Tab-separated table of C-alpha atoms and ligand atoms in Angstrom:
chain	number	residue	atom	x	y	z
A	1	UNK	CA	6.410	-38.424	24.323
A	2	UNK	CA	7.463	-39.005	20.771
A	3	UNK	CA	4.378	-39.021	17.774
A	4	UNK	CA	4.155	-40.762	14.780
A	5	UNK	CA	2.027	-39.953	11.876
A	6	UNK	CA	0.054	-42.838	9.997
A	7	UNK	CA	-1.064	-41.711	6.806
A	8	UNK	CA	-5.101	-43.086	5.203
A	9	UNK	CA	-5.899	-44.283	9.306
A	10	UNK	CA	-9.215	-45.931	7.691
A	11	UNK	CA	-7.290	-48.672	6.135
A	12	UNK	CA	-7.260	-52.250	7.500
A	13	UNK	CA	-2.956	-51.988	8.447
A	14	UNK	CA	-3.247	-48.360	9.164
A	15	UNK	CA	-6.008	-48.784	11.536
A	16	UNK	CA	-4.351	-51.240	13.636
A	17	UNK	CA	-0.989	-49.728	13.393
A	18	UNK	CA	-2.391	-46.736	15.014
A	19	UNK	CA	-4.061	-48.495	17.404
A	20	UNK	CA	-0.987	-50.224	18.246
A	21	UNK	CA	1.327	-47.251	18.136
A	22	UNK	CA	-1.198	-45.815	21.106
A	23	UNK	CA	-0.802	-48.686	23.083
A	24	UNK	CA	3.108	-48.765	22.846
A	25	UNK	CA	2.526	-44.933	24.380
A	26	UNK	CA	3.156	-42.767	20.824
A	27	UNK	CA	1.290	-39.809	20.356
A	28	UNK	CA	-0.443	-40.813	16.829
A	29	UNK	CA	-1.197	-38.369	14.060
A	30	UNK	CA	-3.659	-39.996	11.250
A	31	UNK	CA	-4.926	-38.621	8.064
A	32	UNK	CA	-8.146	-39.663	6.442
A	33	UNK	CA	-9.792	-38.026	3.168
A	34	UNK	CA	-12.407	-37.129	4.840
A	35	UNK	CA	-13.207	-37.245	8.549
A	36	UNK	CA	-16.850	-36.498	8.791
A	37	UNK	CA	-18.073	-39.750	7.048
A	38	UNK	CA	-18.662	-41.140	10.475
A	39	UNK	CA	-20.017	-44.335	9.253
A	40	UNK	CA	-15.930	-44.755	7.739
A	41	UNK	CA	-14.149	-43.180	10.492
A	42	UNK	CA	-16.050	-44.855	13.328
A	43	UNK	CA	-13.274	-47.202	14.309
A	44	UNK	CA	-10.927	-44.357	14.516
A	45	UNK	CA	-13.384	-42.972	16.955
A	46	UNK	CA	-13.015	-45.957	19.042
A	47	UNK	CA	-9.183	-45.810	19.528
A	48	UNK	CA	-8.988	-42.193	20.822
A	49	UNK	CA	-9.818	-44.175	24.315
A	50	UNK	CA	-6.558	-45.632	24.265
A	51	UNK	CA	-4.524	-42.206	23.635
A	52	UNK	CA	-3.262	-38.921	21.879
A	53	UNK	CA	-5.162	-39.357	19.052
A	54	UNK	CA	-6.105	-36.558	16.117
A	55	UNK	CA	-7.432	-37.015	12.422
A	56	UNK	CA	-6.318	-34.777	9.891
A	57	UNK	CA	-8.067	-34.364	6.749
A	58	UNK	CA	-5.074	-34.565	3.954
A	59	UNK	CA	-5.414	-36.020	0.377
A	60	UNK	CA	-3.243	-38.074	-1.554
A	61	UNK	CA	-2.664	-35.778	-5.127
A	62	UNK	CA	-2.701	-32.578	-2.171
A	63	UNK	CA	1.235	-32.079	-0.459
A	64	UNK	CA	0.642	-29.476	0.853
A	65	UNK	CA	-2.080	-31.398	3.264
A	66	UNK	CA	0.642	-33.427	4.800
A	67	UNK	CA	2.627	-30.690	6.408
A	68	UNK	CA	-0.007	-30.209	9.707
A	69	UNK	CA	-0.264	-33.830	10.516
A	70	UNK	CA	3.819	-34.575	9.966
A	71	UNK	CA	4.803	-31.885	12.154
A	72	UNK	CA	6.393	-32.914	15.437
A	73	UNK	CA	6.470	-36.370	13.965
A	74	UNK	CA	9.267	-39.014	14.387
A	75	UNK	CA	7.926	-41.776	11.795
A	76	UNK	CA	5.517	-41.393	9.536
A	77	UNK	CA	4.088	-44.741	7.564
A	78	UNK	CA	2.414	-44.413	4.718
A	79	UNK	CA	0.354	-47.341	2.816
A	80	UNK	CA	0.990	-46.947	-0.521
A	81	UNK	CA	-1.182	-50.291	-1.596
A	82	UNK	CA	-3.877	-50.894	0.612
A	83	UNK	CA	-6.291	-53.964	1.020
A	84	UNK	CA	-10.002	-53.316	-0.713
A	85	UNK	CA	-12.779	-54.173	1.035
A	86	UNK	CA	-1.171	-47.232	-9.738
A	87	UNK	CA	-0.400	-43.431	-10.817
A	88	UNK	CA	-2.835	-41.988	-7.688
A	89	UNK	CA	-0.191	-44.117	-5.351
A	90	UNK	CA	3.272	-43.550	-7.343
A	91	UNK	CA	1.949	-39.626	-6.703
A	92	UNK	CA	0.840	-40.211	-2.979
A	93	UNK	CA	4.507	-41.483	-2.064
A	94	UNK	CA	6.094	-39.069	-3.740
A	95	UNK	CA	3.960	-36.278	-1.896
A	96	UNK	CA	4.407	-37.689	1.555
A	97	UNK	CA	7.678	-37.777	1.391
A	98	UNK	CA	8.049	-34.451	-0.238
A	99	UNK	CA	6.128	-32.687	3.265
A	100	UNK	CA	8.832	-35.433	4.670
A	101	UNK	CA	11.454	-33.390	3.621
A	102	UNK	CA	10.297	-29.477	5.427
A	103	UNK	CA	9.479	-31.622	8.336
A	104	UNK	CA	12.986	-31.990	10.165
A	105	UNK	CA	11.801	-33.753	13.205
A	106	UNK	CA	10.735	-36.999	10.687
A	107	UNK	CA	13.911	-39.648	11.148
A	108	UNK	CA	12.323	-42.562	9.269
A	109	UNK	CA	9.413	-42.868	6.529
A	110	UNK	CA	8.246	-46.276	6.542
A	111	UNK	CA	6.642	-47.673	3.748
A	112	UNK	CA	3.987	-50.287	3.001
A	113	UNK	CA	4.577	-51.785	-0.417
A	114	UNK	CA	3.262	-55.294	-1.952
A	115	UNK	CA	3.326	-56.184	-5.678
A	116	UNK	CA	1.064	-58.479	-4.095
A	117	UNK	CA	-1.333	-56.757	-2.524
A	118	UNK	CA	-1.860	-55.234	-6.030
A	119	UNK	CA	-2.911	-58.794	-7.271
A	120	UNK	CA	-4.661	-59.855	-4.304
A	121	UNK	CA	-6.921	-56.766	-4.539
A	122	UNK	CA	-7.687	-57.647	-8.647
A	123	UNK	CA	-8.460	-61.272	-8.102
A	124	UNK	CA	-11.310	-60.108	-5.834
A	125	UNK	CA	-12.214	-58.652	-9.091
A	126	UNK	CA	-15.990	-57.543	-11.061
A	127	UNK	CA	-17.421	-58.577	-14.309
A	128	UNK	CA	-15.585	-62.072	-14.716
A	129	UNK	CA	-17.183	-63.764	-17.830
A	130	UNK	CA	-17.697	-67.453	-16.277
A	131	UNK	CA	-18.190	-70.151	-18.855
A	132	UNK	CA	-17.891	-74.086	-18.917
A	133	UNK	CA	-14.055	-74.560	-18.502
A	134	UNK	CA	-12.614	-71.116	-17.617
A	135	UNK	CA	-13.914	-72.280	-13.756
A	136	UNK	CA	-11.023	-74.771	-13.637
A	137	UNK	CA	-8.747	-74.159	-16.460
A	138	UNK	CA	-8.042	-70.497	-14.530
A	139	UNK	CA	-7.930	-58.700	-14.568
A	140	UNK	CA	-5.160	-59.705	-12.332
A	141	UNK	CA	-1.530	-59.155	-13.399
A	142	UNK	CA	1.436	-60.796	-11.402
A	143	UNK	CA	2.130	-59.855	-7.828
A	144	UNK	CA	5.445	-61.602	-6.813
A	145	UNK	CA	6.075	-60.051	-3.695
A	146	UNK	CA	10.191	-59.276	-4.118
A	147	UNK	CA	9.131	-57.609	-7.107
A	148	UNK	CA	9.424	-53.198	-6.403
A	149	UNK	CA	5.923	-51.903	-7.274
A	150	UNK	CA	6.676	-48.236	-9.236
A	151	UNK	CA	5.546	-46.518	-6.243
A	152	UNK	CA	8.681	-48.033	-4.350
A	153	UNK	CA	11.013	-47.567	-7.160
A	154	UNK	CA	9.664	-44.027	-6.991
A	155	UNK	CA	10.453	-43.858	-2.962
A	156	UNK	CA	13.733	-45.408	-3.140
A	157	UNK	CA	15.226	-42.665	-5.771
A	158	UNK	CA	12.943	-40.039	-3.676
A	159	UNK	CA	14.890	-41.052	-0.542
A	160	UNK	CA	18.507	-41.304	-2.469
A	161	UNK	CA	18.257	-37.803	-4.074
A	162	UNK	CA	16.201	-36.522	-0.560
A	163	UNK	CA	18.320	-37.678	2.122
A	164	UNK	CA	15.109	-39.272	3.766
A	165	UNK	CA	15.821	-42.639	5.719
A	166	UNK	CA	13.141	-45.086	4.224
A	167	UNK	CA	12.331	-48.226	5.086
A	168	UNK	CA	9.408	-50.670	3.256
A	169	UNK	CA	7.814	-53.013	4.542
A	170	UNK	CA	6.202	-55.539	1.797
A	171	UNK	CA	3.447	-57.925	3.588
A	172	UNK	CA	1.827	-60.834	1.667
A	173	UNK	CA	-1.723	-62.117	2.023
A	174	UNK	CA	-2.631	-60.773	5.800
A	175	UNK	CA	-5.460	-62.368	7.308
A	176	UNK	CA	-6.618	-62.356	11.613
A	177	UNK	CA	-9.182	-59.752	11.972
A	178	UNK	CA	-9.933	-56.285	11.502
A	179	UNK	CA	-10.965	-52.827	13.369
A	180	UNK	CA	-12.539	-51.431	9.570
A	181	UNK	CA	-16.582	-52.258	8.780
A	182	UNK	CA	-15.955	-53.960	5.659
A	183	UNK	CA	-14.339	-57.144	5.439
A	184	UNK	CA	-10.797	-56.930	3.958
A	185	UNK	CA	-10.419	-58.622	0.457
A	186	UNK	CA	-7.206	-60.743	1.857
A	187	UNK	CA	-9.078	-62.381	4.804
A	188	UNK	CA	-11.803	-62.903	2.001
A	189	UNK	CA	-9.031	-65.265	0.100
A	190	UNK	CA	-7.310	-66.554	3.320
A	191	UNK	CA	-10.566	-67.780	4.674
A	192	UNK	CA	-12.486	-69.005	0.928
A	193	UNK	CA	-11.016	-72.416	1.805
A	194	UNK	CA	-13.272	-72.523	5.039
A	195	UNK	CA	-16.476	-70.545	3.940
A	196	UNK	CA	-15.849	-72.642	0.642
A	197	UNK	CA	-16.575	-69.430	-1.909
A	198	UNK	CA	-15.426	-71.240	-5.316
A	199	UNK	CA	-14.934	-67.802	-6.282
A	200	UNK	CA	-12.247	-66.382	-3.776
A	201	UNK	CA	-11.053	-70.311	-3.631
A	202	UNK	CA	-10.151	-69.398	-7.516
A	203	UNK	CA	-8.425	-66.132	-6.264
A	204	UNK	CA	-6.185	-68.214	-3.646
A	205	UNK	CA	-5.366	-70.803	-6.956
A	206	UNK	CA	-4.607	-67.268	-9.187
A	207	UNK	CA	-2.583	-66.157	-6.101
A	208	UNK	CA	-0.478	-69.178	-5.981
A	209	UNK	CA	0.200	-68.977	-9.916
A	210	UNK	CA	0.206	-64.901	-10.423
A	211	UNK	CA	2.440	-64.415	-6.895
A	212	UNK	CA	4.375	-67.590	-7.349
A	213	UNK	CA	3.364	-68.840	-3.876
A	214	UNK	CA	0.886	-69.226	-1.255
A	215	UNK	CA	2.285	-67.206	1.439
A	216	UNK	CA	0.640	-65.413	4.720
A	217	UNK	CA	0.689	-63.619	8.101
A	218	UNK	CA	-1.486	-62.031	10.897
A	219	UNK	CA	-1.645	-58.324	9.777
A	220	UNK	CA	-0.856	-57.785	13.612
A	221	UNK	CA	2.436	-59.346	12.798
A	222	UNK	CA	2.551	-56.949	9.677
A	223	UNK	CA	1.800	-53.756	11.900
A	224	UNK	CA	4.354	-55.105	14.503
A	225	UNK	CA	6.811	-55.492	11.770
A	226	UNK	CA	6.500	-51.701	10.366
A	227	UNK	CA	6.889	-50.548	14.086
A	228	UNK	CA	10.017	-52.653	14.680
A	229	UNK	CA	11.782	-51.331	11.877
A	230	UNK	CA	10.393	-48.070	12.805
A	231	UNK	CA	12.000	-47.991	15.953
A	232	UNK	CA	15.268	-49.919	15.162
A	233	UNK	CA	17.998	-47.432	13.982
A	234	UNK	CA	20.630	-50.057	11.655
A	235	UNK	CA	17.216	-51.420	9.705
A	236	UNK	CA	17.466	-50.580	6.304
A	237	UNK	CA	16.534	-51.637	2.958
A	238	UNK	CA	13.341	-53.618	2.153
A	239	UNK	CA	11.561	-56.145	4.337
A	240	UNK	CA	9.133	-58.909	3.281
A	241	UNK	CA	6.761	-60.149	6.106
A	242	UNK	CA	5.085	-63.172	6.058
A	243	UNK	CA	4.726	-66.338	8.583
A	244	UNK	CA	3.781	-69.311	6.159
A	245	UNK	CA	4.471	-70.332	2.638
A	246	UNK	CA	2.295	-73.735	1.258
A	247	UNK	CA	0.145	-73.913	-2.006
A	248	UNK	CA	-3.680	-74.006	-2.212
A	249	UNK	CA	-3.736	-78.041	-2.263
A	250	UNK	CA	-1.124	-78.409	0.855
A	251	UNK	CA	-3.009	-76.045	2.611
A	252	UNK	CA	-6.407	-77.148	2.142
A	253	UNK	CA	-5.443	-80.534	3.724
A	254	UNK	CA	-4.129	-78.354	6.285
A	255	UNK	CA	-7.454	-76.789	6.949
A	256	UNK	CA	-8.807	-80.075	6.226
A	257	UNK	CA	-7.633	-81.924	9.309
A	258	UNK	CA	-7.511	-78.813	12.097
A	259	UNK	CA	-11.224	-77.853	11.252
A	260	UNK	CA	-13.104	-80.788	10.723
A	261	UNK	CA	-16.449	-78.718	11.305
A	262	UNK	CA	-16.200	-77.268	7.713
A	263	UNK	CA	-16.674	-78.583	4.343
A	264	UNK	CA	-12.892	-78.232	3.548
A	265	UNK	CA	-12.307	-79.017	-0.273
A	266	UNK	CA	-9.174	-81.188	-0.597
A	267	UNK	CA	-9.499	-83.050	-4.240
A	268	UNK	CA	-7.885	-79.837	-6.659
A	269	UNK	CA	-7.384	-82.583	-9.724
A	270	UNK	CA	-3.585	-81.813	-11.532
A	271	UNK	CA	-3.209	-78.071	-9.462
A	272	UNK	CA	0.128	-77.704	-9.096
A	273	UNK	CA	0.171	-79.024	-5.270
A	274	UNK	CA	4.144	-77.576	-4.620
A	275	UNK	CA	4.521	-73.194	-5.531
A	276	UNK	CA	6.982	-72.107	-7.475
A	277	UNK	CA	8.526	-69.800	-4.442
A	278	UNK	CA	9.069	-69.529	-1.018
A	279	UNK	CA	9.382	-65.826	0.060
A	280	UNK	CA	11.697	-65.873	3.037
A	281	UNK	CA	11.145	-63.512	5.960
A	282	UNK	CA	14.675	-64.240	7.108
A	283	UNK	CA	16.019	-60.624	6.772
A	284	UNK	CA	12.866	-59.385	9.331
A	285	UNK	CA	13.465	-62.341	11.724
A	286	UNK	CA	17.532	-61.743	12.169
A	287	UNK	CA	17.006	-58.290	12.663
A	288	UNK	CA	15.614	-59.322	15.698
A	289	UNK	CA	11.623	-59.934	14.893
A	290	UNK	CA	9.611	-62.534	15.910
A	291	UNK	CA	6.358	-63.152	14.602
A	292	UNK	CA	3.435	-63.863	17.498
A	293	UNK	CA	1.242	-66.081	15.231
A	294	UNK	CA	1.972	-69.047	12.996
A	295	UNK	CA	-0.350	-70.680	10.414
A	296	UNK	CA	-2.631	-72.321	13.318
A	297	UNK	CA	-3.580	-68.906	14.668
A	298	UNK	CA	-3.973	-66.832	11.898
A	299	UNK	CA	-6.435	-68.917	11.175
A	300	UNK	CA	-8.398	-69.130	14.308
A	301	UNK	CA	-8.758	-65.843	14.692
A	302	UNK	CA	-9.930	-65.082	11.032
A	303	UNK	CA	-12.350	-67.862	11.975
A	304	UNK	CA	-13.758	-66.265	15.057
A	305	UNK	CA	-13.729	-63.181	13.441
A	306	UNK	CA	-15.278	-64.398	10.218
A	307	UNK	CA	-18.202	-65.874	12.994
A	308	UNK	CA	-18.897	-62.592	14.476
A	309	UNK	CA	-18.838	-61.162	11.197
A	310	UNK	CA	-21.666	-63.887	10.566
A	311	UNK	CA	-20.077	-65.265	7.707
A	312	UNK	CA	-19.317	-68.582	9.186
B	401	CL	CL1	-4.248	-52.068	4.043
């Protein structure tokens, strides 16, 4: 039986990565800051049904926490820029990987890394003066997703000097469902189109300008993804995962016409209707990935999960 270790288990990928390592028939190994909050560990709770599960508490600025839960270890992934619901995460990588290094049975570290992500969680932002003509003529810095965040420049030069085999694995906006209590921010966005929150509608339009595109996946696709690479020995290098590229206006008339129930806004004036990029998953996909769910299903199930969240 081989074991993997998913660092911060709490998070919206790390949750269902875990979940998903157990049913592939890994032994998983999770961290969380701290385990007793039930009300935040709860899920966790839930998927020690499906296997060898155990929770570690470990923190972050620690390294010297990461040693237990490593141990005996094939893979360990590590988020280094989780979903909501900069020098903390540059110093997380660098400490995972440094208990990486005394642990001899760890072949791969695999790394979750999204300039993106960065953006996505800042234009679900706080405190956003509102006037007149700031609503339309759109804080949040840019997130273009081939761009290295410093907390993969800092893994990269980490693994070269280290002799650690690395892998990252840089996802876009994820959407579907997920096994954490709060609502991720990114299914927030994705779905702002059908709930028709102005707001997060104004995030997906700052998206499409601040990470030159408009571009998606399932985060079950995403977890899949960091498992395949995981597992197969030549990957290496960087991957981007993501299904679907389009723009706010193209995909609006999307939504439009497959869920007429909804008031779907189409009319977005002079928005640029065409993004500037198109991030290609081609490296992920000739590797020998295929992605389960395309535009039309990450979207029905955000929708029924947005229902039974009672938000739609
Ligand atoms: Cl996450």
């Amino acid at each position: 039986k081989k074991t993997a270790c998913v660092v911060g288990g709490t998070g919206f990928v790390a949750s269902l990565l875990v979940k998903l390592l157990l049913q592939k028939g890994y032994a998983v190994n999770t961290t969380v800051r701290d385990p007793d909050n039930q009300k935040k560990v709860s899920h966790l709770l839930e998927l020690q049904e499906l296997g060898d599960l155990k929770i570690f508490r470990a923190d972050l600025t620690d390294e010297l926490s990461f040693e237990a839960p490593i141990a005996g270890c094939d893979f360990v992934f590590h988020v280094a820029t989780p979903v909501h619901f900069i020098k903390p995460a540059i110093q997380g990588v660098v400490n995972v990987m440094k208990a990486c290094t005394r642990a001899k049975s760890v072949k791969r570290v695999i790394l979750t890394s999204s300039a993106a992500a960065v953006t996505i969680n800042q234009l679900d932002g706080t405190g956003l003066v509102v006037d007149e003509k700031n609503w339309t003529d759109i804080p949040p810095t840019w997130g273009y997703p081939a761009s290295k965040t410093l907390a993969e420049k800092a893994a990269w030069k980490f693994a070269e000097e280290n002799n650690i085999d690395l892998i990252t694995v840089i996802p876009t906006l994820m959407a579907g469902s997920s096994l954490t209590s709060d609502v991720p921010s990114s299914i927030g966005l994705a779905m702002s189109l059908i709930t028709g929150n102005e707001f997060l509608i104004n995030g997906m339009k700052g998206m499409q300008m601040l990470s030159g595109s408009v571009s998606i996946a399932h985060v079950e696709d995403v977890c899949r993804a960091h498992i395949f690479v995981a597992e197969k020995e030549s990957a290496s290098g960087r991957y981007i995962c993501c299904a679907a590229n389009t723009s706010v206006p193209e995909l609006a008339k999307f939504l439009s016409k497959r869920y007429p129930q909804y008031k779907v806004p189409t009319d977005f004036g002079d928005f640029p209707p065409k993004s500037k990029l198109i991030i290609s998953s081609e490296k992920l996909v000739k590797e020998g990935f295929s992605f389960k769910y395309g535009i039309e299903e990450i979207y029905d199930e955000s929708v029924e999960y947005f229902k039974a969240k009672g938000l739609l």
